[PDB]
Design brief:
This protein has 12 helices and 10 strands. It is of the alpha/beta class. The chain binds 2-acetamido-2-deoxy-beta-D-glucopyranose (4 copies). One 2-acetamido-2-deoxy-beta-D-glucopyranose binds next to loops. It is classed as hydrolase.
Length: 359
């Protein structure tokens, strides 16, 4: 993969239309847009997400376990790879799949409550400590690998656990067999075990993704690249691994690419403070030898609302941030999401700061 990496992170929900002729024209416009952008890589959504409700119910490829909304991942992928000049990473949830109800869900232990529960503001994750979950998610990745050709896998940011998770019964068994003492409440407040417990969960998530990678590689071959989205806080505030179960050094060792969600508004940073936040992030990265060479900084192109009506970030603002990254010595970056239907971000404003081939 030739340097630098410039990544468009693309949902196919926009492309989908019940009218097949319209969907055809949509795909054509998308392929041309990516070609015109002249960048290196597309992270391409393989799952449907029409409602943004943190749970995958349908996918864009034929498979054994979930409804196929439309057979379009493979179709878009091969055209992007041959007409638009990009590598394609299949973007897949790690855990948040609407599978058999008897499969174990991740739960958290609420303060003051005895029974573990599912938090409504979190991804609706299956538990990585349930071996049948591992098998069935494995089957989904195998079905993707068998039907479509691509260059890499992007593991979704839903591979995370808080310091009150996973409280499910199979997770409890896993902790017990690993030597952890007492209840989840006791472990997480034990000075001598809570850091080890955090690391155990981080390793469990990573090991699960590496199992999935191995299964895809068994089908498509060894050259398949891996990437995983990491939240910004585990990078800039490493103690936060306690409530993310993500470790930046672990990512850098385990994956070809660590896709950092360099998204200040997502993190609640004020508009007037966002640039400084990004500078501090890049400083932290540059202080770890060679980290920047295996990291992609992923900027946000929408400002997401709990309300649900997301708001676009101006093309000028996105270009400004891209310029900021370059000026601070960061050459690998991209953005999420892209909206071909409205030329948002505006290709003519973004290319000068995004395409190495510009002017
Ligand atoms: C935070 C996040 O993932 N937001 C995405 C949004 O950018 C995208 O346009 C929409 C359509 O797929 O789905 C949402 O989930
Ligand atoms: C509110 C809802 O139905 N689902 C949300 C989803 O929108 C969000 O992307 C995810 C991660 O915060 O958490 C889920 O619980
Ligand atoms: C069958 C099932 O899992 N139902 C849960 C529900 O009990 C919970 O209140 C809600 C919180 O988001 O998430 C649902 O998935
Ligand atoms: C507020 C803060 O800075 N960090 C908290 C952490 O102390 C807490 O244990 C965790 C609970 O899931 O939520 C984080 O946001």
């Amino acid at each position: 993969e030739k340097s630098p990496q410039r990544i468009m992170h693309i949902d196919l929900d926009y492309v989908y239309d019940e009218n097949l002729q319209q969907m055809d024209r949509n795909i054509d416009v998308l392929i041309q847009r990516v070609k015109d952008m002249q960048i290196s890589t597309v992270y391409l959504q393989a799952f449907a997400d029409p409602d943004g409700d943190g749970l995958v119910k349908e996918v864009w490829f034929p498979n054994r376990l979930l409804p196929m909304k439309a057979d379009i991942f493979s179709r878009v992928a091969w055209q992007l790879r041959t007409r638009s000049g990009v590598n394609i990473y299949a973007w897949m949830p790690v855990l948040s799949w609407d599978l058999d109800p008897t499969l174990t869900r991740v739960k958290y232990l609420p303060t003051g409550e005895k029974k573990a529960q599912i938090h409504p503001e979190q991804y609706h994750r299956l538990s990585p400590f349930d071996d049948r979950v591992r098998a069935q998610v494995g089957m989904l990745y195998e079905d993707l690998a068998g039907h479509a050709a691509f260059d890499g896998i992007l593991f979704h940011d839903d591979a995370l656990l808080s310091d009150y998770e996973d409280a499910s019964a199979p997770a409890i068994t896993a902790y017990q067999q690993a030597g952890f003492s007492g209840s989840l409440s006791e472990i997480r407040q034990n000075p001598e075990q809570f850091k080890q417990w955090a690391r155990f969960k981080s390793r469990a998530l990573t090991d699960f993704t590496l199992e999935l990678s191995a299964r895809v590689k068994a089908i498509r071959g060894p050259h398949i690249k891996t990437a995983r989205n990491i939240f910004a806080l585990p990078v800039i505030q490493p103690e936060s691994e306690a409530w993310f179960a993500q470790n930046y050094a672990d990512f850098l060792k385990s994956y070809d690419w660590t896709a950092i969600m360099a998204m200040p508004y997502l993190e609640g940073v004020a508009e007037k403070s966002a640039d400084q936040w990004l500078i501090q992030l890049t400083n932290q990265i540059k202080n770890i030898p060679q980290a920047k060479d295996k990291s992609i900084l992923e900027l946000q192109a929408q400002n997401w609302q709990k309300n649900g009506q997301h708001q676009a970030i101006s093309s000028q603002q996105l270009a400004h941030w891209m310029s900021l990254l370059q000026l601070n010595g960061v050459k690998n970056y991209g953005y999420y999401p892209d909206n071909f239907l409205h030329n948002q971000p505006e290709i003519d404003l973004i290319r000068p700061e995004f395409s190495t081939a510009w002017y």
